Structure 1
Amino acid sequence: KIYLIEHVIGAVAYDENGNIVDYITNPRDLGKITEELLNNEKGIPFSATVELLKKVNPQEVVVENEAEVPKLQALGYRVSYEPYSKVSRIFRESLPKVAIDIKFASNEEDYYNFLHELSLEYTRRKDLLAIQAVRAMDDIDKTINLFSERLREWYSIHFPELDKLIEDHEEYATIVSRFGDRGFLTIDSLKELGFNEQRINRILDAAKKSIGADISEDDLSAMRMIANTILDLYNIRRNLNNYLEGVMKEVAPNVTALVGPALGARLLSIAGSLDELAKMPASTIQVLGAEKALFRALRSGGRPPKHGIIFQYPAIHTSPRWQRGKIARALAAKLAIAARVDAFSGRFIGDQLNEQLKKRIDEIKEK
């Protein structure tokens, strides 16, 4: 009499005593195990079990599951089942261990790594990239600014007047990247990026009358490394935005209809997932970001933030201070609905949502 076990680990045959008579180890493949587990539910035996019942030639076999019995009878054997058998327990008692013994994994460390990922995939069968992307975007934003701030402080040793003349960081960087020295600056080369007639003249005059320092080619190229990094990041940023837009429309279209890909993703990031954002009340969504401000208010009974990361929505930060709280409240409300239609499936209804929102905003603005 042979007591048969089925597990992620493979197919093991025990005698009545609880000694492994023979085993066949499963392949360490997520795809195949998951399928065989799904199949086992309907009574279909593992393919490892089929091979094992051949190697041993047992007259009376006893399995764990009652659905398996008629399947193994159709295969030629006399079969029964015992529910919470001593054998089945004996096997699981030594299950941290017997994974290594039958060589399913080399050590315990990555038996559990595999089993964790099996479980993850096995329940998946029965938005993260959007989050990561925006998080990197935010890192890039932060860095562009840090480097541009540095570059201006650095490059102004040579050409100080250029700093207050070029507002735009990308433009400023393009100039240091293409030229270095201020005596390399030309009407021709500057037209070749679209700086307007009058501005080119002010730049060149400022470079002529500059009270900057005369400096080696080694010094300038040091600076130009930063300028090129800044230029690289701007391109990477724009690429990340388009990628983000792609995923965001796919994963949460209604939200994206409301606040754009970036800010939408940003809310997902803070919430942790789409389903988590979907479970939230508007009054939470309205304050995400701004945690320092919130808990300060909640601890002391002071005044709460009107808006967290939502501040970024154009209608809020451009509007006067007494309109902002209303706009925020209306936005958050709609976002909660947006997140929920996005989460609990499918339909795009972002057009009416926008329309309702802009109605609410137009009313707010007429006072």
Structure 2
Amino acid sequence: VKIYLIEHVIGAVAYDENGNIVDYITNPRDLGKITEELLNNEKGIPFSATVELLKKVNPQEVVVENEAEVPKLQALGYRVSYEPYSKVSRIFRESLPKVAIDIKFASNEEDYYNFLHELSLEYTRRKLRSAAQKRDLLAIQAVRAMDDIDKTINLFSERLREWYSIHFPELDKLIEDHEEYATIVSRFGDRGFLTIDSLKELGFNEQRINRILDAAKKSIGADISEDDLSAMRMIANTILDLYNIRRNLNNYLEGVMK
């Protein structure tokens, strides 16, 4: 007794391998019930009409249209297999105004389709809300991560400023912007590497450059080794990475809030 399970808006229908109806349980004509029943069935939860049908039939093997239903029904003690686009399910759809009438879901065609139309409007409105709810659940997370990154930038960059100041304390008040400061440490290390030509790569004009070069020449800081700079550069590069990560999240946030 191999049965093919058809689960439609109209209800739960049992078919044999030649496309004959063995037994059926019709859905109630309730928009809310059918809508929410279709939603769980996308995840692979059987219709409550299916559960009743598989009781008063109880076949040797049931074949199903959705492979997420397989393990759910194998918890109820059925032998369950999956056939993607079976002849029998096609045979069900070929007959589909008519059988809605035959199993008494609709009194005629006009009202089957009137109900089908009411249904599809509810079902997609439901899925709209929930797609909108998920989308902006994801967007607040992106927003809050940006806050987390902001806070972190201030933290690490205040650490870098204190740490690097042992070598070149003068620079801290000369570079307001955390990204510019991190860039100088990351790029040039030693205050002794700073040249006119390299500071232009950051777009500073004559006054800023000559102030910074002056500070490095007359600097009060200590000499440092390549291992010392190296460790400081781990913080400096992390700050740069986070500015980068912040910008990419803002692109994500726009495209999605859009």
Q: Report the secondary structure of 2:22's partner residue.
A: strand
Q: Classify 1:28/1:233 alpha carbon distance in 2 versus 1 (closer, same or farther; 3 Å).
A: farther
Alpha carbons of structure 1 residues 100 and 194: separation in structure 2 relative to 1, 3 Å: farther
Cα pair distance change 1:158/1:60, threshold 3 Å: closer
SS in 2 for 1:160: coil
Aligned partners of 2:73 and 2:80 also within 8 Å: yes
Displacement after TM superposition at 1:166 (Å):
0.9
Shift of 1:146: 0.6
Contact kept in structure 1, 2:167 and 2:224, CA below 8 Å: yes
- 1:107–1:149: structure 2 CA closer, same or farther, 3 Å change rule? farther
CA pair 108-145 structure 1, distance change in 2 beyond 3 A = farther
Is 1:152 aligned with 2:153?
no
Distance of 1:164 and 1:14 partners within structure 2: 81
Structure 2 contact 5–64 (Cα < 8 Å) conserved? yes
Report the Cα offset of residue 52 of structure 1: 6.8
CA positional deviation for 1:246: 2.6
After the TM superposition, which segments of 4 or more aligned residues of structure 1 sit over 2 Å from their partners?
A: 1-126, 245-248
Structure 1, 55-64 or 175-184: larger mean CA deviation = 55-64
Greater alpha carbon shift after TM alignment, 157-166 vs 74-83: 74-83
Number of residue-to-residue matches in the alignment: 249
Give 1:157 deviation, angstroms: 0.4
Aligned to 1:209: 218
For residues 6-33 of structure 1, the C-alpha deviation after alignment (integer angstroms, 9 at most, x for no partner) is 9999999999999999999999999999
Give the Cα–Cα distance (whole angstroms) in 1 for the partners of residues 192 and 106 of structure 2: 67
SS at match of 1:44: coil
In the aligned structure 2, how far is the partner of 1:204 from the partner of 1:10? 81
- State the Cα distance separating 1:165 from its structure 2 match: 0.9
Q: 1:12 to 1:179 in 2, by over 3 A?
A: same
Structure 1 residues 198, 151: CA separation in 2 closer, same or farther (over 3 Å shift)?
same
Q: Deviations over 1:305-336 (max 9, x none)?
A: xxxxxxxxxxxxxxxxxxxxxxxxxxxxxxxx
Residue 247 of structure 1 deviates from its aligned partner by 2.6
> Distance in 1 between the 2:107 and 2:165 partners?
60
The equivalent residue for 1:138 is: 147
State the distance in 1 between where 2:109 and 2:161 align: 55
CA shift in 2, pair 1:2/1:188, >3 Å: closer
CA distance in 2, matches of 1:19, 1:83: 19
Q: Compute the displacement of 1:77 (Å).
A: 21
Q: Which runs of 5+ in 2 are unaligned?
A: 127-134
Q: C-alpha separation between the residues in 2 aligned to 1:102 and 1:158?
A: 86
Residues 1:181 and 1:11: Cα distance change in structure 2 (over 3 Å): same
Are the structure 2 counterparts of residues 7 and 183 from structure 1 closer, same or farther at C-alpha, using a change threshold of 3 Å? same
TM-score (norm 1): 0.38
Q: Secondary structure at the match of 1:5?
A: strand
How far does residue 182 in structure 1 lie from its aligned partner after superposition? 0.9
Residues 96 and 158 (structure 1), Cα distance of their counterparts in 2 relative to 1, 3 Å cut: farther
By how many angstroms is 1:58 displaced? 10
Instruction: Please report how far the alpha carbon of residue 223 of structure 1 lies from its aligned counterpart in structure 2 after TM superposition.
Output: 0.5
1:161 to 1:41, Cα distance in 2 relative to 1, 3 A: closer
Q: How is 1:71-82 mapped onto 2 (pairs within 5 angstroms)?
A: none
8 A Cα contact 2:11 2:26, kept in partner: yes
> Deviations for 1:149-193, whole angstroms, at most 9, x for unmatched residues?
111001000000011111111111110010111111111111122
Could you state the TM-score of these two structures normalised by the residue count of structure 2? 0.52
CA distance in structure 1 between the partners assigned to 2:245 and 2:85 by the alignment: 59
Which residue of the partner structure matches residue 56 of structure 1?
57
Pair 1:197–1:76, CA change in 2 (3 A): closer
Rate the CA distance shift 1:53–1:236 in 2: closer, same or farther, 3 A: closer
Matched, 1:177 2:186: yes
SS at match of 1:206: helix
Contact 2:180 2:202 in 1 (8 A): no
- Alpha-carbon distance in 1 for matches of 2:25, 2:158: 64
Tell me how far apart the structure 2 counterparts of residues 160 and 108 of structure 1 sit (CA, whole Å).
Answer: 85
- How far apart, CA to CA, are the structure 2 residues paired with 1:19 and 1:152? 80
Deviations 1:314-360 (A, max 9, x none): xxxxxxxxxxxxxxxxxxxxxxxxxxxxxxxxxxxxxxxxxxxxxxx
Tell which has more relative contact order, 1 or 2 (C-alpha 8 A, sep 6+).
2
